[PDB]
Design a protein that fits this description.
This is part of a larger assembly, with three copies of chain A and three copies of chain D.
Chain A (H helix, E strand, L loop, with lengths): L1 E2 L2 E2 L14 H21 L8
Antiparallel strand pairs in A: 1-2
Chain D lengths: L1 H4 L1 E6 L1 E3 L22 E3 L3 E8 L5 E4 L2 E4 L4 E3 L11 E3 L9
Antiparallel strand pairs in D: 1-4, 1-8, 2-3, 4-7, 5-6
Classes of the chains: A mainly alpha, D mainly beta.
The structure holds zinc ion (2 copies).
Amino acid sequence: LEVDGITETIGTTQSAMYGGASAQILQINEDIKELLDGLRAYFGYNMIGL
Amino acid sequence: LEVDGITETIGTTQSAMYGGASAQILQINEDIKELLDGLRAYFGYNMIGL
Amino acid sequence: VKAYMFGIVVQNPDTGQPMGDEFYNHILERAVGKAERALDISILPDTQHE
Amino acid sequence: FINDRGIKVLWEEAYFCPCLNPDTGHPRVDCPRCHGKGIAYLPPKETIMAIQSQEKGTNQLDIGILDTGTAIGTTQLEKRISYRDRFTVPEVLMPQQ
Amino acid sequence: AIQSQEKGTNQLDIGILDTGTAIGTTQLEKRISYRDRFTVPEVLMPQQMIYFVNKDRIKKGIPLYYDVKEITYIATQDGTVYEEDYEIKNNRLYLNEKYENHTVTLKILMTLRYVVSDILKESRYQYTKFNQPKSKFENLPQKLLLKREDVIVLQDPY
Amino acid sequence: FINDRGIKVLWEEAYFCPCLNPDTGHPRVDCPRCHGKGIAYLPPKETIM
Ligand SMILES: [Zn+2]
Ligand SMILES: [Zn+2]
């Protein structure tokens, strides 16, 4: 936006592909993956005898 | 921003894909991977006799 | 922790207040839990009855 | 955008003072409602205005020095500023001798 | 910060004069005022002078037009003048009475000097809020128009 | 950059000639040190400009 030679300009983290919180969600998903691997080592694999 | 003959432009490390601390987190993940390989060599593989 | 971020401060841009050490202690206690699950170990001393 | 970029100002609206001499047409120099200017002012109104090119415009004359400086102002929306309306900028202090 | 440092030579029936002009940008949070004076001790400008020397000027010393910091060349009809035969004190030039009917010519250096003639941007502003407890008003750099001190010449401050 | 782009010139430095008339203030038109100009010149110096 420009008025009378004052100019203000923004590029935001939004884009036609990625949402404003894309990066944070990707990092959170990485952390979730590590946590789930650890907890799925703490609790065992399910098994049953037929 | 341009105002009365003062102009400033900034590009940040933030982007629509990557968060501002992406680089540091990636390097820390590399360090964690090296440390975990070493420690999983210090403690052994788990084993049980069925 | 802060030693590894020498020359940075984490600071609320609306108030200038630094982040409280309570969050650091909370994060440390969870990081210890994570380390105790990435490796099949008990780090902090505790009495076990089996 | 204007509220971000402008400085706070007090706006007060001009009108001709009713002290003008009914014959000569000039202001009464002792008028308390206007201090010898022909123009009286309504109570002040708080507004934000963006200001540029704030030049002092020093002049040096046989009568003495004078300031004729000029600036360009961009108003807020939906305002009808009128000729010889007056602005003051309480944040900004100018040195004089 | 200083730009466009023009000498602005004028040649007149009264003699030569300098009317040069420059543009200056101040530091933050300063309120420069009309006819405030600046000197730039790092920067030396060349100037030229000539005087006829007479018995009065021998006894009293020639009052120099410029604030001479140093002499680069000094000569007379008889040739170069050696440093044992002249002295400067208090911006007066003293000569050996040998030269009581001579004319002396000089090249000199003097410090650059300016006076504030006009202020092209006397106010620029910003409310700053980011990382502050509350909005703080700050005064941005002024733009000055600087005119050179030729007509009336004053000593350096020290 | 300047040495590449400039042309070679001879520079000679001005000073007022001491032949100026002590009363009228004007140069002597016959002066050999300055040929009627009020300005004498020091020996030339090679420079690039
Ligand atoms: Zn009135
Ligand atoms: Zn001559």
